[PDB]
Write a protein that binds this ligand. Sequence first.
Ligand code: A1B1M
Ligand code: ZN
Length: 140
Amino acid sequence: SGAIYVGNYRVVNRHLATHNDWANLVWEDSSRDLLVSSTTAQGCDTIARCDCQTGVYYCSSRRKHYPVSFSKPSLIFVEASEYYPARYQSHLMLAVGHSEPGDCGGILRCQHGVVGIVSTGGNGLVGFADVRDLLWLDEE
Ligand SMILES: COc1ccccc1[C@H](O)CN1C[C@@H](C(N)=O)CCC1=O
Ligand SMILES: [Zn+2]
């Protein structure tokens, strides 16, 4: 589990969104595994606006932050889970790292700010849903 709190937005994995998220919906995209809801309180996270390919992510199944090298956002085939059919997930970045299904939500960050959140993985892989192209998270 986990979310990004930027401005008056909450960014979560679409597959982990709550009823309150769906009842206060700003935007959702199944192909990216992302959903954004509105918040009453202002958040403290800042979004990175860059093309970094190195950063650090939080892994809840190890209580640890790991430094990683990761691929550029791409269209990558993801194996069937309890949330999605085997399919093509867009704007996904992969790295070598430990990951398990409850780790979705952990933040990946670079020197510029938050890059994205854990969305996939398995066999020493971890996939991150990028958020750096969502420029509207910085306003309104
Ligand atoms: C962190 O992910 C894992 C970890 C260990 C093993 C397998 C995985 C999966 O890739 C994660 N997965 C895919 C998600 C998606 N974005 O399509 C939907 C829900 C899900 O369980
Ligand atoms: Zn960066």
